[PDB]
Ligand binder design. Structure first.
Ligand SMILES: Cc1cccc(C)c1N(CC(=O)Nc1ccc(-c2ncon2)cc1)C(=O)C1CCS(=O)(=O)CC1
Ligand SMILES: [Zn+2]
Lengths: 145, 318, 550, 244
DNA sequence: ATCTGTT
């Protein structure tokens, strides 16, 4: 109560999402926004990880976690992409196996009640860890307020 | 700062002493009195004394003004800010009291200058003096008055000046230093200067162990009425002390009820603040030592208690 | 306002001052005071294997907190109220304190703690930790911890004792304080009337002979062996001179200020077999006092301890809650990990000089700092988006050849190509630690005969008009000024420029400024040559300038 | 241009060499009065344009060619010592010889061999402008490396450098005694501790100027919570003073 | 992985 009265009220994730004409309910409502955002994510991946770019040309979205202040969606490579699964963006493991690395888009609320979209990965190689979610980069989606 | 010797046992009530001090600081500039005894002090700390707080200023000489012309000159200096010429100081200087201060300094300087490795073993026919007899004779032949200091200054001027510049550390500061440390406000520049430098050590209350920032903070809430004066001090005049001395001497915060009630308010305000701070700290410490929870909850409690005690709104109300 | 931001600090430092003053007035017993014969025994020693078990009394007061707290604002009240000696662990700490202390009321020049106990330039090469020591006690006593620290620091401890005793005219007892005391007795004066004026008459005495309250700032960067060095050197310098405080049976009080969590001590050793340098983390002074059971009960650290729990450099709610979790070792939750994801960017984004211009890149290694620096300089040449010319300057290292023979003879290894020795010692010959972060070129070696030296030369790349720091004490001679007129007027109006200089070149400073002022004229009409200035105003300026000239 | 093109004032004023403090003080006071008056007249004549006009002043003749300064002989000018908390700007370098720097190098350093060899082939001096705008020339950095093997000492090598460094990049260890404004951290994944992140994260005042290449809280890190427990247990002590 | 004392 003291922090709310002193530092000011902070916007929840639902209001921020609604400001973008998106509702976390109904499933597809947030999937549509994720699809609209996917262009920027893929552009950033190409710019900074050029080697791992063909894996994200045709990727479908699927929700994974829908907590009150954090949303996590998965990026499934539709059905045809040449490579079966996606490859780890942080390390080059021993080639061969794609070192299964599930890719996620995480939506949260940042500073100034803005929307933060982060790229997360889960790699099953012992070197990386597995059972751990890693953040690759964070970008702003507040252009279309 | 002007005062009189008590003589009475029980220090008068706060109002009694306020009334006694207000009549001493006449509302025109001239103190009430026929004869004055003025000790001139520089910055620096005396050595060998034990007190709660270390000293800030240090006397250099003492003068007595009793003649009509001398008293008039002193009143003019105190009321308007005109400098005192060396003739008056040389005529009214009290030699016995003045040179009791520079008594051990002459001995120390003489020992240091003469401290070249002695032998006191020439023997010969009549050239054998005791090991400690040399220093005994040197001290016996050394006059702890104007003669000794004059001789030391004449022959060993550099050493004497260097030694004296170290006993009065910080005694050579420019007008800008005084304006920045104690200023820039007129009320602050007058009251805080007089209290911190001169009255805090003499009165020796609870405010003698508070630094200059605390004294300025206390002076901030001494919100007595103002009376705009024609013009203030300015740069390009701080190359000399005349302008600032005239500005401060002819102020309205230098006489009367304004100057008679600041030392009292200092103690009143300090006591009032401590009365609340001590109780709140006791509550916090009692709850601190008996709370059986966890580290996260304990940190939450610590910071929540300190916020509840000292959030900006509560401090503003206090 | 500025009055309520100091309310909680000014009423809470009073209990601290009461305890520190009470600690500094406690008197020892005549049998506990270290004697001047203790240090004569050490000076007559060859190995630390003959040190007897002796205790050097001391006291401490802890003042800890984070880096944003007002724990250093507590030293401005100790300095104004108490008679103490303020020091610094490093030279930057000593210069930050002087700015704070001198900017409040007044202060004397502030030095490091190494300058006060006699650390000279030949002790910066001593090898520490050779002789082995075993604590013959499960609850080790103070004498056991003190003798352990005197054995680790034996190379420096032995040198300091020899210089102190030897420099005292040999057997000649120092006469600075003894001469006045004898005169004081003969003249029948109050005790301490004359001996306390020695500092004024003699202006070369150490600061350890004038006070017993020693304030060390940033004590978390100091090794634990340095608590004994300060205690052992305070007693040595007072027993030697027989100062008034030594004769009063007083003991040193060490007020230790620092942050025990965001600062650490480092220990490095040289292996002469592989020509390798090894660095490990050691115990600092603060961790020694807080963790050791013998030191914690001897010093009664529960009564001599103050903690500051504010942060003036954190006005953000969610960021302040993360700093609290990290300092106090609270469990990390999932809402903390979500918060930290805002600051993440690709590594190739950070290590790109075109991105985030003007930011400081923090790496964990010296090769990564050097690698990025080379990329920045190369990018500053080709693109020329804003010029920023880049130039290289020469550097030379002169390797003596007789000494290398002596070193090579003592440790065999004949070949030992000077290039390989210089590469391995790269982290030791230099004075500052940032020598390894510099952008240097290929390493070339050559032999100069007749004079019998080996000179190695290299080049270092710098950027013009860039912000740099001088990581050393180098004298500089000024010769001019470059800026706008408003800048010049400000400097001459205020005498603070003269004050910053020492009290020996004020006439020189006035002469130098007087010389610059005379030649600083002219060029007013070149400024008057600015396009489209005026026609009549130019003539009016000439008439006014002549009128002022007349 | 008009007939008055060279500030004829010079043709009438001739400042002589200084003398004892009385003479020095008189000269300085008059010159400061003259300098301000010309500033007042020109400021009154033009105003702000004169205030921000480019300006300079040097005791001798100095020419800046590219990254270099060209001067005859640097003589006069007060000596000082460069600080470590100060901020300077690198203006260039010089080959002008300074007797004061050379003579002290002869004095403090007993190694005359390095003094003569450096004298024969001198190194350039660095020219720095401080915050206020005063050009300065800083002496070289010479360090003597004496090795102690079995207490045997031998000054085998000497390193001559400039002693300046840049705040553009450093290690995380050297940043624990510094205060920064904008920080970009590059952690190494695997050689990561929770206390190195705490030190790096707290170098700035606000979190709007902080970047990192990974989330240190979400990765495998080392924790050493020995000191934290001691600090936490002192906060429950009734005898410890807690000051906010 | 790694800093600092002289100066
Ligand atoms: C505690 C307090 C008292 C009075 C006034 C205020 C403004 C506060 N503050 C500010 C505060 O605590 N800042 C801080 C930031 C970081 C660190 C730190 N860094 C590393 O280690 N520690 C320590 C202190 C609060 O935040 C309240 C706000 C309402 S509340 O929720 O009732 C209690 C906390
Ligand atoms: Zn992987």
């Amino acid at each position: 109560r003291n922090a709310l009265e002193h530092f000011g009220r902070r916007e929840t994730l639902t209001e921020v999402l609604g400001r973008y004409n998106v509702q976390p309910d109904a499933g597809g409502t947030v999937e549509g926004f994720a699809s609209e955002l996917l262009g920027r994510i893929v552009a950033c991946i190409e710019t900074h990880f050029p080697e791992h770019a063909g894996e994200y040309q045709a990727v479908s979205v699927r929700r994974a976690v829908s907590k009150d202040d954090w949303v996590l969606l998965q990026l499934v490579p539709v059905r045809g992409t040449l490579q079966q699964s996606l490859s780890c963006l942080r390390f080059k493991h021993g080639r061969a196996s794609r070192a299964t690395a599930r890719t996620f888009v995480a939506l949260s609320v940042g500073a100034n009640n803005r929307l933060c979209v982060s790229l997360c990965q889960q790699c099953f190689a012992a070197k990386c860890d597995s059972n751990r979610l890693h953040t690759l980069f964070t970008i702003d989606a507040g252009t279309p307020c | 700062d002007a005062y009189t010797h008590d003589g009475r046992a029980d220090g008068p009530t706060e109002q009694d002493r306020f009334e006694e001090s207000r009549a001493l600081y006449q509302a025109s500039g001239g103190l009430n009195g026929d004869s004055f005894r003025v000790t001139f002090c520089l910055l620096g700390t005396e050595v060998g004394g034990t007190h709660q707080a270390r000293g800030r200023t240090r006397p250099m000489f003492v003068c007595r003004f009793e003649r009509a012309d001398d008293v008039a000159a002193l009143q003019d200096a105190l009321a308007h800010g005109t400098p005192l010429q060396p003739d008056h100081i040389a005529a009214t200087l009290d030699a016995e009291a003045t040179f009791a201060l520079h008594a051990n300094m002459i001995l120390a300087l003489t020992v240091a200058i003469n401290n070249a490795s002695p032998r006191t073993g020439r023997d010969a026919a009549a050239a054998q003096y005791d090991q400690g007899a040399s220093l005994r004779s040197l001290v016996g032949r050394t006059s702890l008055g104007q003669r000794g200091l004059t001789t030391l200054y004449v022959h060993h001027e550099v050493r004497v000046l260097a030694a004296y510049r170290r006993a009065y550390y910080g005694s050579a500061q420019s007008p800008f230093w005084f304006l920045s440390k104690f200023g820039p406000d007129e009320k602050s520049l007058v009251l805080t200067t007089r209290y911190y430098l001169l009255q805090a050590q003499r009165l020796g209350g609870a405010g003698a162990t508070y630094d200059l920032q605390a004294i300025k903070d206390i002076c901030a809430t001494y919100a007595i009425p103002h009376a705009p004066r024609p013009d203030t001090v300015s740069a390009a005049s701080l190359t000399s002390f005349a302008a600032i001395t005239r500005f401060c001497c002819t102020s309205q915060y230098a006489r009367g009820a304004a100057a008679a009630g600041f030392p009292l308010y200092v103690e009143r305000r300090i006591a009032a603040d401590v009365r609340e701070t001590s109780a709140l700290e006791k509550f916090i410490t009692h709850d601190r030592s008996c709370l059986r929870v966890s580290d996260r909850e304990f940190i939450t409690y610590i910071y929540l208690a300190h916020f509840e005690c000292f959030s900006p709104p509560r401090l503003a109300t206090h | 306002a500025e009055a309520f931001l100091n309310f909680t600090s000014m009423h809470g430092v009073q209990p601290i001052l009461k305890r520190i003053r009470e600690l500094s007035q406690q008197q020892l017993d005549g049998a506990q005071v270290p004697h001047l014969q203790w240090f004569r025994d050490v000076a007559a020693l060859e190995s630390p294997a003959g040190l007897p078990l002796r205790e050097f009394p001391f006291a401490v007061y802890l003042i800890t907190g984070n880096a944003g707290s007002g724990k250093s604002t507590c030293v401005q009240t100790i300095n104004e109220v108490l008679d103490c000696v303020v020091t610094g662990a490093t030279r930057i700490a000593a210069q930050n304190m002087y700015a704070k202390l001198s900017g409040a009321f007044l202060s004397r020049p502030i030095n490091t703690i190494f300058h006060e106990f006699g650390f000279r330039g030949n002790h910066v090469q001593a090898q520490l930790g050779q002789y082995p020591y075993t604590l013959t006690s499960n609850p080790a006593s103070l004498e056991d911890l003190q003798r352990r620290d005197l054995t680790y620091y034996w190379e420096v401890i032995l040198d300091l004792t020899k210089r102190a005793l030897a420099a005292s005219g040999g057997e000649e007892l120092r006469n600075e304080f003894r001469a006045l005391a004898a005169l004081e007795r003969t003249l029948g004066l109050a005790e301490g009337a004359l001996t306390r004026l020695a500092p004024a008459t003699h202006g070369a005495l150490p600061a350890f002979t004038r006070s017993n309250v020693i304030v060390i700032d940033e004590a978390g960067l100091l090794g634990r062996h340095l608590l004994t060095a300060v205690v052992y050197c305070w007693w040595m310098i007072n027993a030697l001179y027989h100062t008034p405080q030594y004769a009063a049976r007083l003991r040193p009080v060490l007020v230790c200020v620092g942050s025990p969590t965001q600062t650490a001590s480092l220990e490095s050793t040289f292996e002469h077999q592989k020509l390798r340098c090894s660095v490990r983390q050691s115990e600092n002074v603060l961790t020694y006092l807080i963790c050791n059971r013998t030191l914690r009960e001897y010093a009664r650290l529960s009564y001599s301890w103050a903690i500051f729990i504010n942060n003036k450099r954190c006005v953000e709610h969610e960021f302040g809650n993360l700093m609290k979790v990290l300092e106090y070792g609270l469990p990390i939750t999932e809402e903390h990990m979500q918060f930290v994801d805002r600051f993440v960017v690709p590594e190739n984004y950070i290590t790109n000089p075109a991105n985030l211009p003007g930011w400081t890149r923090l790496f964990s290694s010296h090769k990564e700092v050097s690698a990025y620096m080379a990329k920045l300089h190369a990018y500053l040449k080709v693109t020329r988006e804003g010029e920023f010319v880049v130039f290289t300057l020469p550097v030379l290292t002169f390797v003596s050849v007789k000494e290398f023979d002596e070193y090579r003879r003592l440790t065999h290894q004949p070949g030992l190509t000077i290039e390989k020795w210089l590469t391995a010692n790269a982290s030791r010959i230099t004075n500052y630690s940032q020598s390894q972060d510099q952008d240097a070129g290929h390493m070339r070696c050559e032999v100069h005969s007749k004079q019998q030296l080996v000179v190695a030369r290299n080049d270092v790349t710098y950027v013009l008009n860039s912000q740099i720091a001088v990581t050393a004490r180098l004298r500089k001679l000024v010769f001019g000024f470059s800026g706008t007129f408003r800048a010049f007027e400000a400097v001459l109006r205020d005498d603070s420029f003269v004050k910053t200089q020492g009290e020996t070149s004020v006439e020189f400073a006035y002469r130098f400024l007087s010389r610059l002022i005379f030649s600083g004229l002219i060029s007013f009409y070149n400024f008057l040559q600015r396009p489209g200035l005026d026609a009549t105003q130019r003539t009016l300026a000439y008439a006014r300038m002549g009128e002022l000239t007349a | 241009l008009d007939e008055q093109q060279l500030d004829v004032f010079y043709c009438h004023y001739t400042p002589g060499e200084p003398e004892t403090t009385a003479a020095v003080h008189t000269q300085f006071a008059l010159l400061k009065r003259a300098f301000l008056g010309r500033f007042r007249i020109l400021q009154e004549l033009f105003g702000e344009a004169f205030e921000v006009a480019p300006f300079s002043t040097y005791v001798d003749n100095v020419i800046f060619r590219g990254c270099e300064m060209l001067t005859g002989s640097p003589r006069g000018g007060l000596m000082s010592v460069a600080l470590q908390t100060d901020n300077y700007t690198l203006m260039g370098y010089t080959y002008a010889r300074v007797f004061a720097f050379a003579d002290e190098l002869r004095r403090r350093h007993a190694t005359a061999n390095v003094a003569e060899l450096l004298e024969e082939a001198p190194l350039p001096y660095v020219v720095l402008r401080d915050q206020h705008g005063f050009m300065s020339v800083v002496n070289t950095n010479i360090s003597e490396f004496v090795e102690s093997i079995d207490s045997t000492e031998l000054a085998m090598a000497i390193n001559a450098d400039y002693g300046i460094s840049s705040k553009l990049a450093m290690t995380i260890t050297r940043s624990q005694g510094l205060s920064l404004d904008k920080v970009a951290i590059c952690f190494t994944p695997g050689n990561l501790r929770l206390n190195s992140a705490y030190v790096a994260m707290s170098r700035t005042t606000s979190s709007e100027f902080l970047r990192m290449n990974l989330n240190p809280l979400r990765e495998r890190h080392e924790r050493d919570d020995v000191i934290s427990e001691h600090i936490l247990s002192a906060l429950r002590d009734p005898n410890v003073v807690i000051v906010y």
